[PDB]
Amino acid sequence: NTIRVFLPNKQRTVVNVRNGMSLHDCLMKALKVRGLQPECCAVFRLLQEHKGKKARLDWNTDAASLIGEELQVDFLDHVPLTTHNFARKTFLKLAFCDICQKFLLNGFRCQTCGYKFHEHCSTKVPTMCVDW
Amino acid sequence: LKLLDNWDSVTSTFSKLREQLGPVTQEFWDNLEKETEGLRQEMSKDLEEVKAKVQPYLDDFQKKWQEEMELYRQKVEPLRAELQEGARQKLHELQEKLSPLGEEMRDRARAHVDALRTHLAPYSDELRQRLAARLEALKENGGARLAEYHAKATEHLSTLSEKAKPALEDLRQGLLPVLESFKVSFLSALEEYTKKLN
């Protein structure tokens, strides 16, 4: 009885459920290790014939009924999915830009992603730093 | 309904393709086995003969290569000697010029710079005088320009008030009812999108 537990971004933690463990029960384990709140979280099951929307389930749903299925938790509390973060700070070492042919001194960098770009490059790139 | 309807046909297509895939892989692998085995049989020819014939082939090349290296070694010595003796003279002639022409160029450089220095002495002072004359002119004229600029800016600011107060008020008084008119059309349009696309 294996359950595919997926977290935001691309984190996966397949745990071993037995006897009778609900979604909330399993998430209670990860919650302490991750150190977050289930308040802004929502449980979504595998996409079952859809154009592009996550079907929400319940917290009392048994994980045994989702054996082999991929269950992902997303931040449905105002704006879902992992968005790009705009933070300005130095880097660990002088590197090159991922947009222009120059060195990256003091620009912008994401927390979830972690891209390397200049201040101008912020809106110079039409692609998000989200990797699969 | 249409999605499920069409999906049903796609499913049958997948099934038929899968059913056909069986024989296909068997047939393909069957011919592939003739190709793999053929290459295996030929391996005792391609690789085997290339391994046996590579012996006299590489031997001939290696031997000739050794001869080439031997000849190169026997040539590099006298040639390097020629290069050394030649370089000794070639560099000697250069040195024989680097001393006199070098010293001469050095002394000439002194004169070159000396002439410039002697000329730059009055020029630098005059340049400062010129700069001072310009700076003073630009200071007096600049003061007049700035004073006038400030006046013009104040006048433009006064006329700007006609845009910040009357014009802005007019814009506000015009936008207010317009926004209401636009809101009505916007709201009704929202309904359309929830009527036709729903």
Binding site: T2, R12, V14, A95 | -
Partner: protein, 185 residues
Amino acid sequence: MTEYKLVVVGAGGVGKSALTIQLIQNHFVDEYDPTIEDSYRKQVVIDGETCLLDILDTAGQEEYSAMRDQYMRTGEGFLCVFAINNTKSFEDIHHYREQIKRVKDSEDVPMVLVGNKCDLPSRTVDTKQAQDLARSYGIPFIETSAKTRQGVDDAFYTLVREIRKHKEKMSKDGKKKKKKSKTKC
């Protein structure tokens, strides 16, 4: 960005998941929780360039799995983590090593021996024992502990260093029977 596939293996109770949690999440654990399929991701800028560490945790409590053989084959750097407070883990190292050899279809792969729980007074396995065994296999050995968190950061870096040398060595060799295999840069 540079991508490095890191797969960790070890016996159930060597602190395999503890090292990862205390490294990426910087969190400490207490209750033992059998890990089946976990993976951490971080876009770190080592030496300047952006490097994505694709770490994959395995199940310490398991025999043979077809699925394991699959994803373990897509790995480059392997960490042989074991607890020095238990001789069982020391012996299991050989089994895990042989397993990888078959899966990777190679006798020489980027593997690093890591002795976890080295700060504990229950030192059953001595450093010289593992170091000598490692030296006779051509693998590096680093002492670490998820409790103290000392050397964990460099331990994972050491693996990357092995991977970089592996690819270089491979290009300078060509998978041939060469007695001399000592080249770098």
